[PDB]
Each structure stands twice: as C-alpha cells, then as structure tokens.
Amino acid sequence: QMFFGVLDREELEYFKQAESTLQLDAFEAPEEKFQFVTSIIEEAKGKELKLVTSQITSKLMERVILECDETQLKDIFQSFNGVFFGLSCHKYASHVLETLFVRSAALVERELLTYVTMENMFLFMLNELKPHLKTMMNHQYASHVLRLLILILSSKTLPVYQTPESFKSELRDIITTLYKGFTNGAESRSDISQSTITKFREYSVDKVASPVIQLIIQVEGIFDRDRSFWRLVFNTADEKDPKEESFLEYLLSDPVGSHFLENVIGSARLKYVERLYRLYMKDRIVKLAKRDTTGAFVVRALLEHLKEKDVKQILDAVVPELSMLLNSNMDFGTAIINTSNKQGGYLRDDVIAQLIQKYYPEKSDAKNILESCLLLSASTLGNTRDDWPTAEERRRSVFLEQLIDYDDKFLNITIDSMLALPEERLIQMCYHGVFSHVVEHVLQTTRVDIIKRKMLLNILSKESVNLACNVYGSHIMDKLWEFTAKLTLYKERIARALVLETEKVKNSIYGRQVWKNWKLELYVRKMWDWKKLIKEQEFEIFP
C-alpha cells in the first residue's frame, strides 16, 4: 500500500498556499481558523492518501489533524482504513499516523469521561495491524508506529492519558500476537528452539527492533505474570547456560547491548536480575565496572535496582576503584557515591579518603576543589563571548553537589575554596547558568558555621539587588533569607538594600520572587511583624 498517486499542478499550488496561510496564522478568531481548516479538509476529500504520502504535503496533513475538530479527526482516521500498515511503513505517512494516533488517544480519554466512537475506530485499525505486527517490529518506519501504539495502550508518556479497559486487553493481544510470532506456536515453552531464542536475541540488539523489545519487556508485566518476552531473551533456571553466557558477555561489551540490559534491568522482576548478577556479573564486577562505554552502565543499573546485601557486595568491590573510575567516568562515580549514601554511608571512610586525596590533598597549597573538580579556570565562567555552560560543566557540578551532600567535609572544603577565590570570580559564579547552582547548594544554614556564613554573606550582600534581579542569582538571594538566621544585622542590611531599589527589584520577575520570600511587603507595611518573623525563624532553624 505504498503508492497512491502524484499531486497534480493545481493540487500542489492549492495545498502549498493553504499551508502557508495556515502557518501565517493571521486569523482574528479561532472560529475563522477552524473554518479555514475545514475548507482545507473539504479540498482534501478523496485525496488524503496522496497528501499524507507526498513529501510536499504530509506536514500540512499533520497540521490539519492537529487543528480540526473531533468530528473531522474521525473522518480523516477512517479515510486510512485498509492502508494503515502501508502507511505505517511510509517514510512520510508514518509520522502522520503518529500525530493522528496521539490525538486520537487523547480523544478516547474524554470519550471515556463522558456516531461510531473513537474507541471503536481505534480498535478497527489495531485489528488491521495485528497480522503485520512482526513485520512492523523490524521495519525502519513502522517500528516507531508500533512502539507508539504500545505506549498508548499501556498509558505511558507519549511524544499520559487514561484508557478504556478495552485498551488494556488490546495491549495483551498485541504483545501476545507478537509473542506467538517470535516463537513457533510452541505452546509451552518448550519446544522453543535455538536458533529461535538466538534469533530473538539478535533482534534484542538490533537497531530497529531493540527499542520495541525493551518497551515490551518493560510493560508486559501489566498483564503477564510470567514475563514471556523477558524469558525469551534470558533463561530463568538456577544454573549457567553456555549460549546465555556468551550472549551476556556480548551485551556487557557492546554499547547497544549494555544500554539494552541497563534499561530492562529496571523493569525486570527482582529475582531475575539477582540471577543474572549472581551467574554472570558478580564474579567480574570490577572488570565490568571499568568498561566505561558498556559494562559500567550495567553495573550502575545493578547498584540502583538490587537489594541491600548485593548492593553492598558490589560496593565492596567498586569503592576501592573509585579514584581510578573517576578518571574517565564521573557519572558512574557520582552514582557510586550516591548509592553509598543511600546505603547509610557504606564505606564512607574509604570514599572520603580517596576523594580528599584526589581533589583536595591536605599537603597541597594550591588546593581548591572548584579548580580540581570544576576545572574552573578553564571553564566558560566569565567568558565575554556568548558561551553557554557545557555538558561537562554540568556533569562536574552535579558531581561536586553530590560530594557536598555526602559529607560536611566537602561542604566545608567547597566553601573554603569559594572564599579562596578572588571575590569577583565567586560573584561571576552566582550569575553562571550551572555554577550558580553550586553556590546555592552550599547555603545550608544548619550545616555551615556562623563564621563561615558571615564570610560568604560579606561577599554576596554587596550584590543583593543585582543577584535578586537575575535568573540564577535570585535563587541565592532566596536562600539567604534562612542563611542569615542568627545574623539579624546581615538580614537587615540585605532587606534595606532591596527596599531601596524597590522599583528595580519589583520590575524583575526574579526580583518579585525574592521580594515575596524576604516578606518585604511586611518589612515595609508592618515592620513589627517582620521583626517578629525574624525572631521566630531563629528558633525554627535552631531549636
């Protein structure tokens, strides 16, 4: 169902102009726009298949589908009856189907909370697709449509709607149909053979099919206690199998295979994950952890989804390697530290000793954790060009914030490192899209000694108004309302500075937030009550 004809000279002129008018959007009322869309639909009657399959017009068709009313949506839907599979396979029409299906899914939701219905129309195309599901899964365009349909039928996030119970049944029937196709009507297992299992493992790591397999393993548990597709990829018995082992060794040394395994571990039954770990990973965890681009993603997934005893076993093995892992794989290092924290600071002394040695050796005079961990001097901080903050900068910031949350030692080291900068450089951080958040992160009132608070405040308070009016700086000013607890003079100085620039501060959307959080309406209108809030805050923060 691939070719439906070419658009002639007149149709091309008309639909180009209509598309142009539609995007200029000069209509003065929604009613005018709807009427114009209707005029487009009227001209498209009998030509819809040509229009969705032509590169020139397929995007107009998506617009129309988005802009028309419910009744028109239904008519456009039925105009595709009998060719859904061919359209799903089409380079341009498949994207039209996706737009259609997503809007249709939203319509069955309100059709549920209140002629032939959208629900029944949707079921008709599902039944038309059922004999093609296997071909779709392997089709470079139709696999995306299949994947979207499974997302819709399982009520998951589309490019999240509630669904009829008929949808839950369709999910079951679609996945079961696919299941019978990838077996041979085996009817148990067994007799599923290798190479049928091997052929399915090949799809598992196939560029086209693999995202569909992942999603299926992810949702099949909604209606299948036995996890049939999970069992198709992996075994369930209590001992190793040679073929499963070689496949596992491939996944753990292959980028797609590792990300596949990483994703399905989060949705597998716990005992199935414990089994893969026990049989194929536990005795080689350190070796796997050192594979930055492959196996390490799997080790991280184990740390996030296994139970306490196994997680601590992995930590026993990987924590001694933490400094070395941090050399090339900071994201993994962050998750290891995070997991140690979640497991009650497990191996804390070893983690801390290593991080101190690597980022803040107490024998070094040049020591500064902003420099060793954020590479501050070589960063985009203070650049005169229009350089946004980079991905590496955000990564290093997230790592440092994790350290600050791990132990007061790193909070105190970070603050000392900020106080060690030239004052201008620390202020620059306050305006930086990523490093500002690091500044905000150290403003933890009950964890920072009052002398340290005074010293930070001596610096920040000079920039009170400009920080308050800034998109990043205003979060810092918000934190300073609590950070100045037990420091009334500092709180009074900042409040006074802001009120002196009342109009400039309230002209900023960020400033108005600070104004609210600093309760400055009270400061101005009912000073006695403001002063009372300050007294109460003190005992609320420091009881």
Numbering used by the authors: 50 to 163, 175 to 219, 251 to 634
Please share excerpts from the published article on this structure.
Nop9, a nucleolar protein conserved in humans, plants and yeast, is essential for 18S rRNA maturation.
We determined a 2.1-Å-resolution crystal structure of yeast Nop9 that revealed a new PUM repeat fold with 11 PUM repeats (R1 to R11) arranged in a C-like shape. Most of the individual PUM repeats are similar to classical PUM repeats with three α helices, but with variability in the length of helices and interhelix loops. Repeat R11 diverges in structure from a classical PUM repeat with two α helices at the C-terminal end that cap the structure. The most common motif in Nop9, SϕxxE/D (where ϕ is a stacking side chain and x is a hydrophobic side chain), specifies a G base in classical PUF proteins such as PUM1.
